[PDB]
């Protein structure tokens, strides 16, 4: 029958083989072994499939070269700001975890050694820092911390001084082969949308920001740095309130009533800064991200089913205690193809609903007890929705009400297909598995005998979705009633792949005829032994339910209206 | 809080075990055919007359 | 009314099993007075009692 053939591809195995095995290659990325902790707490670090990387971005973008400050109390407390104005921030890089903070504005000397500052635990395990470790050619400022003070209350603003006019150190010449200067000279703007540290709106600027006013500060930052030794220093030369601009952007004098009233007692002073510096590893003392391959091999075994057999008396010629052979073949065809085929599919739907939840995608490699190896390429995903045609219909003429339901259900199917493709990332997996073919995910449409006269179009746009190929399949079975099942299949390919929805193990079977003496009878028994089993791989399935379809036709449905309240009500 | 003092233990299991009855000692699905017939009779109806 | 049949009733499959070797097209019976046939036949709805 066409249904089970559509959802489950028939696979023919020669009778001397009792099963088949599948060995799928996987390419993994993982941040490297732990050396001697517990070699990974006796459980090596979870490896992340690279095919998961096309969707999310966390499994990449390492930070193993940035020379971020590390706090080491008792040796470098002076270089970091007073912790009474800001708690230590925890950041993560590699296998190390430590706390970072803003530097102080050096005043009257006391320059800092940036290389000696960033000794992460991986550095110390490697040993003292050498001489050949040289900074990168690009030295930049990340953040500048301004202290807006008025009356005794302090509010901090983290301004990303990175990515402005002059934020990168520029090489300068006196005679010095490695010295770069910075001369940061520009204006920082604090808009109304500007938010304080950890979010929230500043209370000191509320009055101006109600009127849409903005202020600007002149920032005078000077400094010098080396990239072969590691010494450095920085001072703040000036920072003062410059101007006020209105909600449209004209200059407002500082002596106006609102501006002068709101800015009385306001004070702004710099706090510190953070640096963008990397270490050009010339000795190659980095471990980076490694790449490996593994396989999980699974064997599938095919059983032999209980026999289907008829008994008729010997010496007797019969047509009604036994018909022609054709009854045997027809009964076996029914048993294999219809009663059993619509059982695996429903159990699959129930299992997915039970374990994965409705509408909730799970990450790749995040399941192991689920069916099939298909979970090793694609995001697991199963979703279901309901259509209430009686309360979800908009038609004007009673002569066109049927086009209405047709278009409604077709649009819902379209959206389901598109959102499933979006979330599960099937197209990327299809492009990965084959290169000559282009991604054409076919929509396998399972439905009963009622809906196909309402899905197939009559004068209406779209059938199953733009750029989607489809095959509508109907089955008369009464297990299926007002239900639709949809999933992706491979149109043309005839061997088991992780992208195949399910492969039917099928073995040729032959009858045996030999008369038995069981309890003093002689009678010809014709015996047909069945051997087959449905198998299932892909963890993707979509189900849509139709309810009250007869009801909506039964009554007029017209124009749910929002009488939007021009009367004294709101 | 929810998992404090929660113990899990195994008890039993069951088998999907089939016998490959090469000598076939089973009854299976017996197929027969029966014939049922009906009885139909055509009666006489009152006539129509002119004088 | 016509479509809701054949499914919980299974007329077409029964016809195919009973009569083999032809394509089953069920024939729809229409009975009414002199009045309704004015409102049964038009051009504008392809279905009259059902497509096919």
TrEMBL record, chain A:
Protein name: Major head protein
């Amino acid at each position: 029958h066409e249904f089970a053939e559509l959802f489950y591809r028939t696979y023919i195995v020669t009778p001397d083989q009792a099963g088949f095995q599948l060995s799928i290659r996987r390419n993994l990325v993982w941040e490297g072994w732990t050396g001697e902790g517990l070699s990974g707490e006796k459980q090596e670090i979870s490896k992340r499939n690279i095919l998961q990387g096309l969707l999310d971005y966390t499994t990449l973008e390492t930070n193993s070269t940035e020379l971020i400050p590390v706090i080491q109390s008792g040796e470098n407390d002076e270089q970091f700001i007073d912790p009474s104005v800001l708690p230590a921030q925890t950041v993560k890089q590699g296998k190390d975890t430590f706390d970072t903070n803003f530097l102080k504005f050096s005043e009257n000397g006391e320059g800092f050694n940036l290389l000696m500052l960033a000794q992460t635990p991986s550095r110390l395990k490697k040993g003292s820092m050498t001489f050949t470790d040289s900074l990168d050619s690009r030295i930049a400022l990340k953040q500048l911390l301004i202290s807006v003070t008025k009356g005794g209350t302090t509010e901090l603003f983290a301004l990303d001084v990175n990515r402005d006019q002059y934020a990168a150190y520029t090489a300068t010449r006196e005679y010095n082969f490695r010295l770069m200067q910075l001369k940061f000279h520009t204006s920082l703007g604090l808009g109304e949308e500007s938010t304080t540290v950890a979010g929230a709106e500043s209370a000191l600027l509320k009055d101006l920001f109600d009127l849409g006013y903005r202020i600007e500060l002149d920032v005078k930052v000077d400094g010098e740095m080396n990239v072969e030794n590691g010494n450095g220093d920085t001072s703040l030369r000036a920072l003062r309130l410059a101007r006020v601009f209105d909600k449209e952007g004209k200059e407002i004098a500082l002596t106006d009533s609102r501006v002068s009233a709101a800015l009385s007692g306001l004070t702004v002073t710099g706090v510190g800064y953070s640096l963008e510096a990397r270490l050009t590893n010339i000795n190659q003392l980095e471990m980076g991200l490694l790449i490996d391959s593994d396989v999980q091999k699974q064997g599938f075994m095919i059983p032999t089913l209980p026999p289907l057999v008829i008994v008729k008396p010997a010496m007797v010629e019969d047509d009604k205690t036994y018909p022609r052979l054709e009854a045997l073949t027809t009964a076996y065809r029914i048993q294999q193809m219809r009663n059993n085929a619509v059982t695996t599919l429903l159990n699959r739907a129930d299992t997915l609903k039970s374990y994965l939840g409705v509408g909730v995608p799970h990450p790749i490699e995040s399941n192991l007890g689920l069916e099939g190896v298909g979970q090793y390429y694609v995001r697991p995903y199963y979703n279901e929705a309901t259509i209430d045609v009686l309360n979800d219909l908009n038609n004007l003429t009673s002569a066109a009400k049927q086009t209405d339901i047709q278009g409604l259900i077709v649009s819902k199917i379209n959206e389901m297909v598109y959102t499933a493709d979006q979330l599960t990332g099937y197209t990327a997996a299809l492009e990965a598995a084959f290169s000559g073919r282009s991604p054409k995910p076919h929509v396998a449409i399972g439905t009963d005998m009622r809906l196909p006269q309402y899905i197939q179009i009559n004068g209406d746009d779209r059938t199953v979705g733009i750029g989607y190929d489809y095959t509508i399949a109907r089955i008369s079975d009464l297990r299926m009633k007002d239900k639709i099942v949809m999933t992706f299949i491979l149109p043309n390919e005839s061997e088991p792949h992780p992208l195949q929805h399910g492969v039917l193990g099928f073995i040729p079977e032959y009858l045996v005829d030999f008369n038995m003496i069981r309890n003093q009878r002689i009678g010809r028994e014709i015996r047909l032994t069945p051997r087959y089993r449905y198998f299932n791989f892909l963890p993707i399935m979509l189900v849509i339910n139709v309810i009250n379809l007869e009801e909506a036709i039964a009554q007029r449905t017209a124009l749910d209206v929002n009488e939007t309240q021009v009367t004294p009500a709101s």
